[model samples]
Target: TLPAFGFAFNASAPQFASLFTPLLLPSVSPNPNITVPVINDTVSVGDGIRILRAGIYQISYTLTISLDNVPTAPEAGRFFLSLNTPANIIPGSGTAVRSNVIGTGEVDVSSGVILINLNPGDLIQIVPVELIGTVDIRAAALTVAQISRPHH
Candidate 1:
């Protein structure tokens, strides 16, 4: 049987809680900070997910966010699966959530799944965008799996 190529990673605790700076989503322990465990060989931790074999993959991600303190105004947040350096947003892989006033600990979740063709050396990363106010990423996760052979 042929080896299946794929990877799964996540942050179990709060991470990348900056208000506007877009940071690379971190994987489990010993990287960024210990949280969840990761499984893969196509690419090592910290470099994001790298495609070693060209094929079609199903990429999915989910993020849990919270505005822990009372807010005076509403806020919007976006999440996307980005590809390569200076990353490009993967079409159909974008999700957004909003937080409203009186957010004394409101939680929102954003998620997306898309099937896209990938080439060798392609790097994939999950990024938070247009985040406003004090945003806490309660949890985040990303999973990529080869679904079929690549075609035009």
Candidate 2:
């Protein structure tokens, strides 16, 4: 009936679930050419697993630096990964919630989590901000998910 953690419920409750749904982990970086940074690529949520059911979700992420390029805590610590949701209007006042700052100061090979409701067409991406030094994201992998969804 549901996909547990990152797998199907098995034969008795055989509902197939896919891991690493959107193909695989991706590589991203801020483009220097852009007048303003943070205007690079993005990871699309719907593009990943087909979320049969929509509900609350805890999105987690990780980022790594090249062994040789590792920076001091000051440099390494300065940068923090962020998970921002799409811009949405508030229910009544007609106020705009712009890129709601979900999480910060973590998710750099250190890991972090942010809770948000998810559905198809909604994009979930790992964004690196306020970073310094010539850092290189050696490898990035989200936990079978960035995290969950139990296919029914």
Candidate 3:
């Protein structure tokens, strides 16, 4: 079974621009703070339903970053999305799968949506990475979506 959730940048902040620029999302105004929501859901795993396993979930945020004045080369930044997993959930036991860089322009940036095959009870998270630049990063103003699937 697959359970999915999503999140998006709410306000503007320095972190937003620096964090999402690599992913190709519009840079924030650097005034307000970037706020994302938490992921919560229930799934059926066996004869009886139970909370999903706690692990890293695959999440994707759709947005655009304008590499206007920034350097042409690859700049890098790291943004971490948190998942509300159970107390006993452990980390560093899952795989991280990234999608192809989808967009236009010679300075096109890579996509930020990452898919991680998580356990049945793991919480979903968004670990966003952006290349540092002075471009007008425009996050398509969409929710960051995530889904959890059973792994055998």
Candidate 4:
């Protein structure tokens, strides 16, 4: 049988932006705090998800960003999944977004799906690579699951 490895988390509260800031996940589902199935081999280490097994996993997320000020020019931001230990990005998992009147007090959605090979102890999280203007993460959700596991 394939190893059971998967986890999901939702945004607990709105968060301000910064370069490569990890998205806050203070809760999971209807409960408070990052609570997940321990048997899944993935756990919440603060704001990040820590992998306990090696496999090809499908990672995906949706972010709704809001900005109060509508700048004359288009304000932009980017989102991607990255490995935290050595600080590296999982290539091809990035999506660029921008804000406008439809972006002023209005929410812009950005989403991406990535299939990556993960190793034990690899800590991963969603991060904004570039943030411009007064952007805030109004809402977000993340899910990761193993697609294929190697026989070791």
Clashes of each: 1, 1, 31, 0
Model 2: residues with Cα > 4 Å off, grouped in runs: 4-52, 67-108, 144-152
2 versus 3: better TM-score goes to: 2
Candidate number with the higher TM-score (1 or 3): 1
lDDT of 3 by residue, 1-152 (tens): 44454333422432334432222223222234663333335332211112345344444433334433335433333333334422222243221211223233323223455455544544333334433444343433323234434444
- The candidate, 1 or 3, that scores higher on lDDT is 1
Task: Report lDDT (CA) for all predictions.
Answer: 0.63, 0.31, 0.35, 0.69
Model 3 alpha-carbon drift over 4 Å, by segment: 9-16, 19-58, 70-115, 119-132, 140-149
Clashing pairs in 2: 63-109
Give the alpha carbon lDDT tens digit for every residue of 39-90 in model 1: 4445734625778877788887766776654363455577777788435777
Residue 142 shift from truth in candidate 3, angstroms: 7.0
Residue 47 displacement in candidate 1 (angstroms): 6.0
Query: What's the CA RMSD for each of the models?
Result: 4.6, 16.1, 11.2, 3.7
- Give the clashing residue pairs of candidate 4, or none: none
lDDT of 3: 0.35
Compute the lDDT of residue 135 as modeled in candidate 1: 62
Instruction: Arrange candidates by TM-score, descending.
Output: 4, 1, 2, 3
- Tell me each candidate's TM-score: 0.74, 0.41, 0.34, 0.78
lDDT of 2 by residue, 11-129 (tens): 11111112212213322222446523121122323222223335555545444443232343223322222223313311211101111122223223434454445554444433433
TM-score of 2: 0.41
